[PDB]
Every structure is written in C-alpha cells, then in structure tokens.
Amino acid sequence: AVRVAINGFGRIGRNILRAIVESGRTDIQVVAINDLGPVETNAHLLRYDSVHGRFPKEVEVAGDTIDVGYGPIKVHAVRNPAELPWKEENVDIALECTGIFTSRDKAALHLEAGAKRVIVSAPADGADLTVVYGVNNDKLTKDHLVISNASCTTNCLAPVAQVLNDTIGIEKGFMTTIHSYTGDQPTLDTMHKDLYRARAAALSMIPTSTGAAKAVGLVLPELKGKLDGVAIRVPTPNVSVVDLTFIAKRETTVEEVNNAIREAANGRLKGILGYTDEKLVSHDFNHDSHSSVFHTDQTKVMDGTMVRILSWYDNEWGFSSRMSDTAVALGKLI
Amino acid sequence: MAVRVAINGFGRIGRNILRAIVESGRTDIQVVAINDLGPVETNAHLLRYDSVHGRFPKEVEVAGDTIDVGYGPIKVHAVRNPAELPWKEENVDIALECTGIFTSRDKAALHLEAGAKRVIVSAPADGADLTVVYGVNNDKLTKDHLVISNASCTTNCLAPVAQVLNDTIGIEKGFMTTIHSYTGDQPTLDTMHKDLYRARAAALSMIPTSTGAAKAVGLVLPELKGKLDGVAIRVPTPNVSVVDLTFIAKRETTVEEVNNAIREAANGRLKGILGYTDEKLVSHDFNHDSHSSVFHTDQTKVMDGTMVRILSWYDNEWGFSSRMSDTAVALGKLI
Amino acid sequence: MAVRVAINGFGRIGRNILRAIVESGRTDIQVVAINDLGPVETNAHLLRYDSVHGRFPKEVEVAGDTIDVGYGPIKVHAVRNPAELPWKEENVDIALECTGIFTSRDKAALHLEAGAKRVIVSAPADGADLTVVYGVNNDKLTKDHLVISNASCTTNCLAPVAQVLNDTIGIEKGFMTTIHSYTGDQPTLDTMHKDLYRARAAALSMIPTSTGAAKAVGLVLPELKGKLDGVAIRVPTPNVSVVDLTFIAKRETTVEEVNNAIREAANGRLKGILGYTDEKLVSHDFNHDSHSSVFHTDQTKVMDGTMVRILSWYDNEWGFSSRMSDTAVALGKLI
Amino acid sequence: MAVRVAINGFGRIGRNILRAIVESGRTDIQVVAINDLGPVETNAHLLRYDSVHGRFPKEVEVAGDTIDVGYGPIKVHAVRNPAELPWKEENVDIALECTGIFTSRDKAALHLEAGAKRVIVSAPADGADLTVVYGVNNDKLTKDHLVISNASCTTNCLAPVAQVLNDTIGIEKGFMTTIHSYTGDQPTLDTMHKDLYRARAAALSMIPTSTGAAKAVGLVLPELKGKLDGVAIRVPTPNVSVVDLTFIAKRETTVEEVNNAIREAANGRLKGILGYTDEKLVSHDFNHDSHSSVFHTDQTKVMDGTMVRILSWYDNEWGFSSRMSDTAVALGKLI
Numbered sequence A: 001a002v003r004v005a006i007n008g009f010g011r012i013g014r015n016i017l018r019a020i021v022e023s024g025r026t027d028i029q030v031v032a033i034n035d036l037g038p039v040e041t042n043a044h045l046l047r048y049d050s051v052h053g054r055f056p057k058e059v060e061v062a063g064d065t066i067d068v069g070y071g072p073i074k075v076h077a078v079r080n081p082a083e084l085p086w087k088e089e090n091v092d093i094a095l096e097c098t099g100i101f102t103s104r105d106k107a108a109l110h111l112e113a114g115a116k117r118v119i120v121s122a123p124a125d126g127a128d129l130t131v132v133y134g135v136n137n138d139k140l141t142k143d144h145l146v147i148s149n150a151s152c153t154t155n156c157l158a159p160v161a162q163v164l165n166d167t168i169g170i171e172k173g174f175m176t177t178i179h180s181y182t183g184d185q186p187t188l189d190t191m192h193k194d195l196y197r198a199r200a201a202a203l204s205m206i207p208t209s210t211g212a213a214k215a216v217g218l219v220l221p222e223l224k225g226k227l228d229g230v231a232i233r234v235p236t237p238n239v240s241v242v243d244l245t246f247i248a249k250r251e252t253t254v255e256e257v258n259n260a261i262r263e264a265a266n267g268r269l270k271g272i273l274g275y276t277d278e279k280l281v282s283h284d285f286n287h288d289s290h291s292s293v294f295h296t297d298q299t300k301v302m303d304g305t306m307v308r309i310l311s312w313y314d315n316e317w318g319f320s321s322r323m324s325d326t327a328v329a330l331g332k333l334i
Numbered sequence B, C, D: 001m002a003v004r005v006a007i008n009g010f011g012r013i014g015r016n017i018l019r020a021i022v023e024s025g026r027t028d029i030q031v032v033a034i035n036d037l038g039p040v041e042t043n044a045h046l047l048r049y050d051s052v053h054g055r056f057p058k059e060v061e062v063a064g065d066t067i068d069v070g071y072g073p074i075k076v077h078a079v080r081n082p083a084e085l086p087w088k089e090e091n092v093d094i095a096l097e098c099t100g101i102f103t104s105r106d107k108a109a110l111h112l113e114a115g116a117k118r119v120i121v122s123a124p125a126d127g128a129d130l131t132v133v134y135g136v137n138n139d140k141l142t143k144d145h146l147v148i149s150n151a152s153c154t155t156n157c158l159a160p161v162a163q164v165l166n167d168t169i170g171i172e173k174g175f176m177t178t179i180h181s182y183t184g185d186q187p188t189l190d191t192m193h194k195d196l197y198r199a200r201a202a203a204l205s206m207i208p209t210s211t212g213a214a215k216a217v218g219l220v221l222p223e224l225k226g227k228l229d230g231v232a233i234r235v236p237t238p239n240v241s242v243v244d245l246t247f248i249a250k251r252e253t254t255v256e257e258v259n260n261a262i263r264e265a266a267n268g269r270l271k272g273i274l275g276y277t278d279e280k281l282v283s284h285d286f287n288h289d290s291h292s293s294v295f296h297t298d299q300t301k302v303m304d305g306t307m308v309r310i311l312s313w314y315d316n317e318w319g320f321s322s323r324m325s326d327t328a329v330a331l332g333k334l335i
C-alpha cells in the first residue's frame, strides 16, 4: 500500500479519501492530511456533504488524529508545504490539492519536505508528465518526480478523443464544456482577477477559459494542435459535460460512433470510460466514478464527416478516483 | 394608423409582448384584447409582478373585464376555444397566438373563423403560409400570407448571424448547441411527461433537449437549407439563452474578420436586431435586452483557418416579444 | 403475512413509498399493484432516476404491463375511476390513495367498492374515519376504521414535538412557521394559478403560503385543540423542510430541559419517528432521512423562562413515505 | 453643503450606495473617493453590470485613476490599510466603512487617523459611539459621535415595526427568525470556514445562523431592551430577506388593529422607511425597493388576543444602502 498525504482537504481532497473508503481498495493508504483549520472542522466537513451526502462510516477524532476505519490519520495545519513533516511520517506520495501550488516548482516543495513523489490535482506548469489515467498512464517512468493528474475536463475528453480517433479519425475539433460552478467563484458579484469569474455563480451562464482541448493534444500526441475549446459555467453544484464537434477523416454514422465507444467501454477502458443508452440528465451522474460517460442518444452526424458528441463527468467523484489510480501506479515505480 | 392586435394566451410571452410595446413607447401597434383562462385580476396581478423582469413600470388599472395600462381599456377574455372569440366586433386586425397549444396552422386558423384578419404564431407553426425572422426575411411578406409564424427564440438568434457570416465569408456546414433557460413546459420536481428528458426537475440539472431551430434557418434563408443542425441543453436559469455554433467556412478567415463583419451589420443593416458586445459579459447582463441576437466577440474562435466557433446571446422572452410586434406592424401594412 | 398494497397515482409520493419499502428491507408490507394513466416505461424510468433521491439501487425490470423490483411482477394498471379497479381480483388489503385528486372520504372510498378492504389517503382527507400520525395516535385505530388519512408531512413533523413538550412542560399557545421546500404543485416560472402566491416562479423567491398543519395537530392530540396556529414560506430548495415553532410554556423551563425531554422521547417511545441532532447541521443533511421529525437541539431558545422556540427538520418526502407503510402495517393487523 | 464621502470597500453595499445616489438624483451627498483591492477598471466593470440589480443606468467612464458617473471624476484607490488613505488631502467628511473587515471602533477609527472627520460603519460595530436605524433614532445623533454604526439590514427592518406596535399596543416579549438571502461571506460549495453552518454550500440548503439583530433593537429602542431574541435561516436566494416575528402584546389586539397601526405609520411619519403591501407578493417583488421594511399585511395573525405574528420584507442590499446616505447626510450637518 502506497503512503499518501493529502494537501488541501477540499472538494477534491475530501473526496479522494471518501472514494478510497467507499471502494475497499487496499492498494493505497492515506497517512496524513493538511489544511488550514481545526482538526474538528475538517472532520465535520468530511461527515456532512451537500453534494454527496453523509459519510458512510463513523469519523473519529483524537487530538490531532482522524480515524475513518483503518487507523488514525495525522492532521495538520501548515501554510508552507515545505515545512510539512513528510519525512517523519514517511510519505510516499504528496497529493497536492490546494489550488495554489500548481506550478512544478511549487508542487516540488513536497519533495523538499520529505515526500518521494508529488501529484498535482490540476494542470501543472512544468510538469514532468501530465496524466489521464487509462489513456497514457503507461508513459510514467522512474524519471518523473512531479507530475499532473490533468483537469477534470481533460480526463473526460481524452478517452473519447482517443477511441474515436483510433476508429474513424479526427481532422479538427472544437469543444465547449458546460461545467458546474466551483469554489473559485463567488456567491455574489465581487472583486476577482478574472472578470467572468467575478460574477454571481448560481445566477448566470458564465463563459470561461480552459486549456483542456490543447492539453489533450499532449496526452495524445497524435492529436497535437487539432482541438481547441472553452467552457461555460452554469448554476449546478456538481457534474459537467463535454460537447465536442469535430471533422472525421472518413465518412461515418451515428451507429459506428456509438459502437466504438461501447466496445472501448466494455473492454480496454472499463471503469474509466462508460456510456449510457438512456435519456439521462446531469444529476443522474452524481457520484459516478467514471472519468467520462458517453451519452449515446446525443450523437449527431451531419453529412458524413461532421460529428457531435456529448460526454458527462462527475468533476468531483471521477477525478478524485483517478487521483488514487494514478498514485498507486506512480508508487509502483518508486 | 396603428395595427389592432389581440394577444391569445397571457403567458411569459403574451405578457411581455404587451409590456414591450409599453416600455418601447411605440405608436405603430395597439393591444385591444387579451384572452386566457382565469379571472381578470389574476392576469393583472401577473402583469404587475414579474419574477424575472421586475415590477411593471406603470400602474395597471382593472375595471370589470377590462385592463388599463395607460391608454384606455383592454378587453379581457377567458374563452378556451379560439373559434369563439369576438374578434370581428372588437375589430382585430391580427391575432397573436401565444398559448403553445394552437401552433398547428389550422388551429391557429380558428382566429380567422372568430374574426381576426390575420394570425401570427409565437412559435414554429406547422404549415404556416410563411415563417419570419424580422430583419432577415420580412421582405418576403405579401398580401396573401394570412397565418404566419414568428419562428422560435433560438431561430431569431441564429439566422441573423448565419446570414451575415454566410454573405461575408460563406457557411458550408455547422452544428448548434443552444444552452437555454428553463421554461414553463418543464416541471419543478421529476414527474410524468411525454418527453423523458423534460420530465426531470428543471432547476436541478443540465437537461439535453430537442430543437429544430437550426434546420429552420432553412425556412428563412433557403440559401442555407440543409446546412445546419442543432440541439439544446436546458440549465438552471429562468431567462436568457445562448447560441453556441461551430461551422465550416467556405474560405479561410480569421477571428477579426468574423467579429468585424458582425459589427458592420450590427451597426448598419441590422441595427436593433443583431448587436454585439466587446466586453466580458455573462448571461444576466442580457436580461431585458430587446435584440434578437447579441454576438460575443471575445468568444469567437478559429481553428485551421476554416473551423469557426461563435457565441451569441438572446433574451428569449424579451427579444422575441419585441419582434412579435415588429412582425405584426409589417404584416399590418399589407392588410 | 405481509399486508398487500396497491398504490394509486405513481407520482412522487407513490414512487417514494415503494422505494422506501425496498431500501429498508422491510418484510411486513408488499406492493402488489399500481394504477396510473401514463405509460409503463415512463413510470419505470422515473423510479430508476430521481433528481432529489438519486439512483434507485435495484434493478427495475419492465415486462409488458408489469414491473419487478426484485420480488415478482407488479401489475400496472390505468383506470380512470377508482371504483372500477380490479382490487378484488387482486387481493388488495389496503389501497394507498396518492393521486391528490381523490382526497375526501367519499372519493377515496370508491376503492372499497373496487374490492379493497381499507383505504389510506396520502394527505388530509375530509371526513376520514380517523387521521393518523404514526407514533402519536397510532393506537386509536380500530377494526371499524375503513378510510383514513395519514395526515401531512408538516403535521407528522410537528405533532411528535408538540406531544413530548406538552407532556413534559405543557403548551399554552403556539405559532408554527414551516419553511418548506418547493413542491410539484408550484410552477417553474410565473403563470396562471388559483392561488396567487403559488403562481410565482418556484425557485426564484421566498413564497408565503397557507398550511393546515397546526389545526390538524389539535385533532391528533385533542388536548391541544385551539392551541396552535401556523403558515408556511416556500423557498428555493427541492426537498427537506423545517418547523420553526415559538410557544408559551405552562411553566418555567430551560434550554437543557426542553432538549433533554426530546432526547428521552427519541431514544425510547418515539424511536425512529422523532430523532434529534446535537450537531450544527443544515437542511441537506436531512435529505433521505426516514424520520418524521428531527429535533435540532442547538436551535432551542428560551426567553424569560416561558417563551420557547424550537427547530425540527423533516424530509417531506421520505419520512412521510415511510410512515405510509408503518400506518398501513398497523391497519392491516386490524383487518 | 454636500457631505463629502468616501466608500471604503466597493462591494455589494459599497457599489449600491453609489448607485442609489445616482438613481435618486439626490444632491445632498457626494461620493468623492472609492477604495477597494483591485484595478480601477475592475471596480468600474462590477458597477456597470450587476447580476441582481441589472445594468447601471448611466455611462461609467474611466480616465486614469478616476471614474465618473455623471457628475465629475471620483478618485479611485487600492489601499489595504485604512490608516494610509489620503482622507485629509481629499477633504473627506465621512468615511463609509463597508469592507466587512473593520467593524470594531478601533479598526473603524483608523479612518479618522487618515483624515476623515466621521466614520459610519456599514454593520454592527463593537464600541460604536451610537448605533442608528434611520427613521427611528437618528434624532439622537450629536456633534459628539465620531464613529457610528448604521446597524444591520435586519435591525433596520425590525426596529420600525417594533416601534409602531410597541407604541400602539405594547410588546412584552418577542422572538424573531429572519429568513435571509445568502451573502458574500458564504461559499459556493462546502469549505473551511470559522463557522460550521456558514461553511456549507450557499445555494443548496436552508442554513440556520446567528444574528444579534433582535437584541440590537433593544438599543435603538431602550424601552425594548432585553425583550426580543432571534436567529436567522439563510436560504438559496441572492437578495431580499424577511422578518418573521412572534410576540406577546400587552393587551388584547386584533389582526386589523395591528395592520392599520402599520399603514398609518407607513403613510405618515415613517413614509419612505416603513411601507406595506395588501397584496399577495413574494420575495422578488421587493428587489430594488428602497424601504427599510415593507410589512406584509395578509400575513398578520393573532392567537387568543395576545399572541401576535407578523412578516416584513427587506431588500438587504438596496434599502440599507439608501439609509447609509440618509444617515451620512444627517451626520454631516452635525460636523
């Protein structure tokens, strides 16, 4: 079992722990947690969840300790990641989930503190490698010390872009992800570095940026420079969607698009790529641990070569699950 | 000299047709009757207080079966069958059919049986003598078109942008996703519905849904027939929608060319119908904007010189309700 | 052994009764029939997928006009009027009336003609042989009671608190405001309605509304007649409500006494029906909780010894649906 | 004779103080200085476009470090510590403290150190020389009060109602729950916060919370010291709030007497401050209403002559921001 610490006990941080517990997985153990508050507040935030419900197991608090079923977890409050006791606690991997230490050189402070590897829960400027689990995690080597788990959007688009490109070919494509609001937006209109993201989150559709599409051109090099995209933030607390229109290299059909996703889903990317043949809506994919769930009924083909698809993602649950798969795979190279 | 009109179905659009006439100060049209399914006071109450547009900017006087908003009594009805209305007596030039239940052309045609001289449907109308997007094809109206359709809110958003961009650089093929506000045909909580998507609690999810608006551009621009398709996604906002469009241009172009061609038209031929913003705005800033379509310059992308994406906002209540009036006035002149 | 039940109207109430029976594992009641006028496939889809309660955790097999949730086919019918139902053929012990259309005793009782032996209406029911809050006046049911009301979500939340506190300290006078989640009978957007309050966009406002729950407690608990009044305020949430009650005690008391009296009730006589929390929880934390009433200790207030304020949550869907079954099990024993 | 003001903290309240001034046309006050934490152009952009109040009605023009709203350049700063703001230089009569971050007398008074002659805190302030609800106790101001509090939005709503009733029929004892719109100090999603309630996602729940507004009346109105207690529940609306008050009268009363004592104050000495409605309105209807408190008449109830419940609405943003200017004008005359 690889030893991990969670830095930033937030939406991703807490859910990383929750997914581990809810699965019984034994390949990974969380040994410490760090945020900026009382141990008790961390425990209470874990216990009660406005999106996913109540925590399924008792949550025990002992001094500086948290226990969720398998022994106490050392809990901290250290602003500077380089001051953490990673050596003394023998941390194989630091999972960096604050939002503020995403460049390689900052994420690396965990290495200074004593962790052997670092995984940033987001795009990472200067990452030794950027990973979409199930797609390119076999590129990890003994070389990479500080890597990125990509963004929730990249983890949803890449598996779909990969299969379809392998099947039918992608000449050129444009993505708009319609995303649930997120903690880096305000409840009401207020001073912000980004004028779109300044705006009341549950009140509008809000145009926003995202490197997800170009980023896929890097986790799948064969799609270098062929995809571009943006986002629209809307009034939902959790769950998002990818709406991608692209040109196929050869003429195709709705059926062939659908079928190719099904075979991939039931075979090589099982658990990572999924699909529904039903008429579902966003909330239906709440608490689904797939990176991507392809909406069969939404496939469109215009004039042989123009293709539209829709794929869902639980931006919290799916991604937090991958943070674990990625860590277990990274620990094995140590 | 003003066209005499009657609103059938005093819902989100029937109310805002009236309200927009009043806010705009327009003298060319006049509402002379209103019909719905309830007491006069209830209708007045819903005109007075709006959850999305706010309070009615003027007093609303009720006296009998009548409503006064500044200019004299408006006769108010409560008749389920459209065939039974006193359109001939009250001298209705044009009935505006807004219930959402008489969009069929022979169903709309009941307003002529009842006495109106012409009919406009506030939606796509199957079998309409003509379908119109004001500013794009109101020129094709003739003295013979008797029961026309004002298209949909989404169609009035898309067609003016398609027309400009096609005239200027050429559209080969494209796909539309409208992210649209939820509407009165969806429920609060999940429940029995003919469409499995729309059965779902409306303010709780992103809800993919069906729409023929892109294909319908083909009805107002034959040049464009068969070249556009699209769908919708409804989201938890109560008003204001947006067209997100990715298409293949006939020649290489650039972000700048596209925005530019849009400004030119917005500032000239299509002033008031197609507008644009160069600022970083979000959907609520367009609440109560009367444009059919407001192009969002910043969001314009171009990939490999010929794949082009655009984003254009509409107030689905407000623009569309304003255009209902523009269309009735034009039609009125041909009577 | 298990009481055999039929659900009339597979709207939300009806579906959640089923889901609650299945999720709990209980063995004392069984749904053997459903009657509804919409399509069997749509009803299965709505059982499978809930936007408030989430994914139903068992397989749902459609096989013709039948549905199987894990114990055999459940016949689904469509029969306009409840006297025409084949309740005799089907061996129904109790029809659960959940349409919202058949609430009066004489209407609900058509099910008795249709062949069933008892009827339970899932709301207040005019002229009911008895009105039940399970856990409170559960024991006043007889062999002679043939058509009953399971009262309302708010009443099942209030009566248990009122009873404990009245027994312990005494209630002279009180006023209840229930801050309630919006519900299926409110519209998405402003529109024609009998009640002008309920005409307003449901998720855009705090909306004042009347409720009969405080009167109704004076009936379940006769010693409290004329003692309690109240009203509601609907707010933009899809599920979970709360009772905010302020009353005058018969005698001086304290915060700790009030809370302590609730805990001893919840941990004994009223287990599973009235619960409490000693933590700082919010409304979503009670989503999908089967209690009728969950007392919020932290929110208890006393001033000048005798004016008391309390706060108690209810999942207005899930608690009430469980009680439907608890009530029916008991009714069955009297058959 | 126009009081010169600086707005420190250009947030919901800050921006709307400026907006109410422009909109009213009033000429007794002049904003001469704005301070926040970001670029001039960002401050201007948040003034231009407002998700709750809509677009700014006048042009918002930027030149260098100044914005101009129709009446000449307002100087714009970005300075974190208030002791450094050039208040002396710029002849500031009254610094309006609106950051939420300097509410205690010693932090608020840093503005006096900087050059301002007076300070009004836009919230409860520990140690304030006086706490003012305009319309109620502003006659109590003296030339001697240097640092003052304008109370809370809730106290400005409750105090006028409490005054009228108390003066008319007496208040022995009351309890208050305010149902309140979420504000900027709550998160979009569950996250670390110093208060375990307010840590929870803001638009997802009914969230019980702490307020001193009921006690604080007790000291705009000494006759009422120690007689009222209260608490809050935040719910998923972005603006507009309500007071739900239940109290013991000093004598027997009626629904009718309670209501017309309010009408009379509202139409007489409390005009513009306390208003009322006789109609069936909902929260959104009071968006952008400048009253401090608008009494909802149909909601008055009386239990056994002496138990009285009432409901009164407040736009927590728009009403309070207007009062800030009113209070500023009064204070300025005493300098």
Ligand SMILES: NC(=O)c1ccc[n+]([C@@H]2O[C@H](COP(=O)([O-])OP(=O)(O)OC[C@H]3O[C@@H](n4cnc5c(N)ncnc54)[C@H](O)[C@@H]3O)[C@@H](O)[C@H]2O)c1
Binding pocket: A007, A008, A009, A010, A011, A012, A013, A034, A035, A036, A078, A079, A080, A081, A097, A098, A099, A100, A102, A121, A122, A151, A152, A182, A183, A184, A315, A316, A319, D191, D192
């Ligand atoms: N929420 C999502 O949908 C999602 C999905 C994919 C990726 N991500 C990425 O994951 C990261 C976190 O996202 P989130 O949604 O969990 O945000 P969040 O705000 O919920 O979590 C951030 C947490 O870090 C804590 N924190 C701040 N500074 C700290 C410090 N110096 N030391 C320790 N803790 C500190 C905060 O208290 C907070 O609890 C971001 O980079 C985000 O982009 C988020």
Ligand SMILES: NC(=O)c1ccc[n+]([C@@H]2O[C@H](COP(=O)([O-])OP(=O)(O)OC[C@H]3O[C@@H](n4cnc5c(N)ncnc54)[C@H](O)[C@@H]3O)[C@@H](O)[C@H]2O)c1
Binding pocket: B008, B009, B010, B011, B012, B013, B014, B035, B036, B037, B079, B080, B081, B098, B099, B100, B101, B103, B122, B123, B152, B153, B183, B184, B185, B316, B317, B320, C190, C191, C192
């Ligand atoms: N809401 C929009 O953004 C929008 C935009 C463009 C077009 N439209 C179209 O306009 C039409 C109405 O839309 P809406 O949002 O105003 O719906 P709505 O539900 O708000 O309005 C329908 C109104 O008609 C009344 N009505 C129903 N049956 C009637 C009958 N038998 N006789 C008289 N009145 C009757 C109802 O009471 C209701 O007030 C629909 O066809 C819709 O597709 C709507």
Ligand SMILES: NC(=O)c1ccc[n+]([C@@H]2O[C@H](COP(=O)([O-])OP(=O)(O)OC[C@H]3O[C@@H](n4cnc5c(N)ncnc54)[C@H](O)[C@@H]3O)[C@@H](O)[C@H]2O)c1
Binding pocket: B191, B192, C008, C009, C010, C011, C012, C013, C014, C035, C036, C037, C038, C080, C098, C099, C100, C101, C122, C123, C151, C152, C153, C154, C183, C184, C315, C316, C317, C318, C320
């Ligand atoms: N939902 C709650 O929290 C709750 C709580 C307490 C009491 N109640 C009461 O329970 C009743 C139902 O509530 P609900 O929320 O389930 O409403 P709902 O709208 O979800 O359910 C109504 C269902 O009955 C069906 N129906 C309507 N007319 C019918 C008829 N003619 N024949 C057969 N089926 C018909 C509809 O298709 C729908 O599925 C109401 O009286 C309500 O007051 C509900």
Ligand SMILES: NC(=O)c1ccc[n+]([C@@H]2O[C@H](COP(=O)([O-])OP(=O)(O)OC[C@H]3O[C@@H](n4cnc5c(N)ncnc54)[C@H](O)[C@@H]3O)[C@@H](O)[C@H]2O)c1
Binding pocket: A190, A191, D008, D009, D010, D011, D012, D013, D014, D035, D036, D037, D079, D080, D081, D098, D099, D100, D101, D103, D122, D123, D152, D153, D183, D184, D185, D316, D317, D320
């Ligand atoms: N929003 C309401 O309904 C309301 C009502 C009545 C009273 N109040 C009180 O008014 C105050 C502000 O409320 P708000 O809703 O406008 O909050 P807000 O967050 O919307 O506004 C606060 C503003 O102050 C700025 N700021 C923070 N630190 C600063 C500093 N060091 N120097 C200068 N500016 C700084 C922030 O950038 C922000 O623009 C609070 O005390 C609040 O309790 C608010």
